Symmetry: D3
Subunit: 231 residues, 6 copies
């Protein structure tokens, strides 16, 4: 009936992950994968008596890969949103997040609200083809949106004065502000709300299983332990 049965029979759990989003999912020096969600993936696979098989995907290709049935579950710092919910399921959430500006610490007071940010003289930098760009284009009608394809240098462009800010996952803003003390994550009284969860096929029994596993992890304190370790 269900993918749950298929996974139990094959002894393989195919987990898609991007490897481009520390602390959730990133590449080891040896070319392997590591991170909070890789850790969780190992635990889910083990609960199913299954080998963990990591399937590479990317943000632009995530939903195409989903439709093509390239994986059983995607675990990679993925936000729940209604566009994705059109085609897929999500597990129960494991983290509260949301987009938020990262900007020069010296300019923090200037960029608290969309109204302050959405001005002709402002430049918001974004990476191409993902939810960051969608969020910028949906919420900025006046500010310049600068699309920057090289994610290795994107935050550096803010420091270098090519852009005023980027609006990205709060967890990313926070981490980058550590990598670049020059930068600060804006933190109003919240800027946007979202949750992280695991992307699932439209499969009732498999979702019930994944949710039960994640719920036990959450209530037992295991989830918090791993979050304290990684995040």
């Amino acid at each position: 009936e269900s993918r749950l049965d298929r996974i139990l029979e094959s002894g393989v759990l195919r987990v898609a992950t991007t490897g481009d989003y520390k602390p959730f999912s990133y590449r080891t020096e040896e070319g392997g994968y590591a991170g909070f969600d890789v850790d969780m993936a190992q635990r889910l696979a083990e609960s199913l008596g299954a080998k963990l098989v990591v399937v590479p995907t990317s943000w632009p290709n995530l939903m195409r890969d989903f439709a093509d049935d390239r994986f059983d579950i995607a675990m990679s710092g993925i936000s729940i949103n209604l566009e994705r919910q059109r085609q897929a399921y999500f597990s129960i959430p494991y983290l509260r997040d949301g987009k938020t500006p990262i900007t020069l610490c010296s300019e923090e007071a200037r960029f608290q609200t969309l109204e302050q940010i959405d001005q002709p003289g402002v430049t918001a930098i974004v990476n191409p083809g993902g939810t960051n760009e969608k969020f910028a284009r949906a919420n900025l009608k006046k500010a310049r949106i600068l699309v920057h394809p090289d994610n290795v240098t994107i935050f550096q462009q803010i420091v270098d004065g090519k852009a005023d800010l980027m609006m990205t996952d709060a967890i990313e803003a926070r981490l980058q502000s550590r990598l670049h003390p020059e930068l600060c994550a804006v933190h109003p009284q919240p800027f946007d709300f979202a949750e992280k969860a695991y992307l699932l096929p439209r499969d009732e029994a498999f979702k019930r299983y994944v949710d039960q596993w994640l719920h036990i992890a959450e209530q037992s304190g295991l989830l918090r332990q791993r979050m304290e370790h990684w995040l």
Copy 2:
């Protein structure tokens, strides 16, 4: 597979509503529909890229209209109950409510408990064919139950002395006690428990979508904003 796909393809969301229950659902002077649940309906339709098409229904006809597939979702100050759950699904809840007496303020102390209310000398007035009548007949074995078909004058009958009280949705009792300072909503330490939710077909993917949409509204604070506006 799912009604979710059908709605996404047709670009129409059919929402049933009664238009007889301010603040959830009522008629504008022009003959249109307005209210908290009409507002929410517009937001759900928009999230689906769909036109909102309001389908009239009524309390006596609600479940018949459901069975006849006259709508995709019903949004109209509808309480979750197990009788309806026999045939339909409900979304996650958006409001805690429950039946409660509305009575003369001067008589408030007399009507705190079913035991006090369920006495030969008491008259409880009710509207025909809905959950109010069912609740009265299930909980009053001694008191007189007076069925009154004209909802425009029903609360006036309490003030006029034709009945001692009515047991109805707390939100309605509260509102009517504003319309008629003569009346008070009874508020024990609670009288009955119920939640309001949206009536759904037995459709897993569509329910998951609606719940995700409503959950985001709830956690982001949007739901509270609209409740503060309307309720």
Copy 3:
């Protein structure tokens, strides 16, 4: 479509229960069944206009009986675990529990953690073929595990010095420590986490109904009332 419809048509709800686990499920002097979960079962059956038909099962046979479709729901102090979730569904939970040591009160400080317990000189007694034995074998690599088939005398073996402790449901440890003031339930800052819930077939509509019924019981305070009565 659903077992929900079948139950509504037949007017019978088949509930499996073990009758070997006071306060959830036990036998009356007359050979009937009683307990918290029998009480709840009566309420669920009544909500469905159905006769309650109790179907005997046992811990070793529970999942076999499930696979054989011997019952509609099992209600018997059953813990949610992922092994069972492989084949079945669970309702939303009604009690937080988890395994915990029961030991001589005089030895309580010695048996707070698995590390203290899992030592060559320690003997943990367990009943055969259930989750207690599985838990012991999964968590004790050094201590002796003593399998004792006679559940009537099993706790007596601790008092009699044949074993140091047993690790069992906290609710059971607590109750037995009342039956035997000689014994104490260990209570660290928690030892293991689990929830009790009702075992369901993979049936979406029936699960939605059961969950709605149980949710109303929980939020209305009925669940707490019955727990205060029995537990």
Copy 4:
């Protein structure tokens, strides 16, 4: 030692109240006092075996009357603030409130934040000599502040176009928006935070008593009962 002893000996509790703030404190047709805080005052006096003696005061005179020892406690919809805390004590709080704009419903979107409100072309109306005026002058450096002494007509000035909005207690904004459907209370995701509490002398034992009384009212559900009745 304490005013507590003095009140217990004299059998009189002097409670100051303004009588100008329904639902907390207002005047009856006969010239008496009524309201939520008068109700609570009666209960506190009764707990002390004391007569309730209401002592009139006003917002401009409140702290002067306090310094002059004209009362034992003031109960009148009073917000805790640090200016008052310089000289007085407060009981534990009984209501969460805070200032918020009340404006034309048609203009609600324009007045969500101080930044939007504090513009040259905007006029904020306020009553003289209280916390409303202090709040306006502390938070508006550009907008016009219009001082209006006649509290009976002050909200009417907004409707009449003499002012764009007033920033006042949320409970007042809410109530006035009921009196004038023309007006709406602004409700962002919160605009300002404050609590209502009772004004006390610097008297440890008397504060401990009042807090114990109020805590019992809160935890027993009595407080909520009276709030549901009045507010």
Copy 5:
């Protein structure tokens, strides 16, 4: 300045206790004292580098002994009430309780509310000179109140048919219903609210210390540990 300093200098903490209220305070076979509050007392004394000296008191004499300064703190299953708050302080609370009927299990449905209980044909038994008698006389204007001085046999009188019920601390009702399976503690949706706390002199610094000690016990989980052990 404070009793805190005096206790620190003398190295003695005088704790009053009744020894007539298991599980809080009772007598050992050897004539010593034991119980949850004796345990807590030892911990408070130790934190102060002080010897624990237990001072006997009784319910009728508690406040007289307080006034006579016979002890530093009383720890004995004592409820906070406003009568005691007239003269003494209380620590922050450590347990939520309240009076509740204990009655024959077969009669449980008959005695849910004061209204049902307060009838001419009903007899409520009470022990003399304490809060139980005060509660009965304050809340029963019709029922017979039977004063029974022998606390060893008082619950037996209910079983023996000399009385219908007693209204006493919920923790006591619960325990007695264990001692006498014949009896049940009534548990409405709550009957009365009260908290247990420690009785303190009007001494600010000593109260701040005791509260800090108890707060740490509560937040660290120590309090729950001891409650799980004793209660």
Copy 6:
């Protein structure tokens, strides 16, 4: 009467701080003070219309300086403990913390509990004369305690193999594990409980004021804002 009045009259608030505990209190390149608690200190002083005057103190001298009345309040990442509560007051708490091991990440599993840590072959390093040393000596009867006076190099000694771990404030362990990815903060399901608060004189009115100020900061979200900025 109170120091509150004295501060209001003098227009000076003397705040003691150590300047040796980033992120709470540290020295700027210019020799000034900075940090979360310096930020909060500025806000408290401003609320009192007072100049902030920072008074240097140190961990060994803190309580001596308190007794000598060298300051009005101490704000410096100070934990509430009962030893300090003997002489001083604390404000309400602003942060939950507690001691926890920091150790090599590779050795994390070995040092989860005091029992594992307190072994002959283990060396715990500590700084002299503070709560870290007191905690080590109170909880380690077998492990070696190595006292290391140079706080600049103390964590380096763990990395260098001179010690296995240090037990220190969780916030410090966390920060140092960032400074030294080589190290990890242990995070069991909690190791020890403590709160941070501000050290106050035994002065009722001043404590009530400080608590009111801090409570407003907490409930308004200001406290969280500053914590998100600094911590």
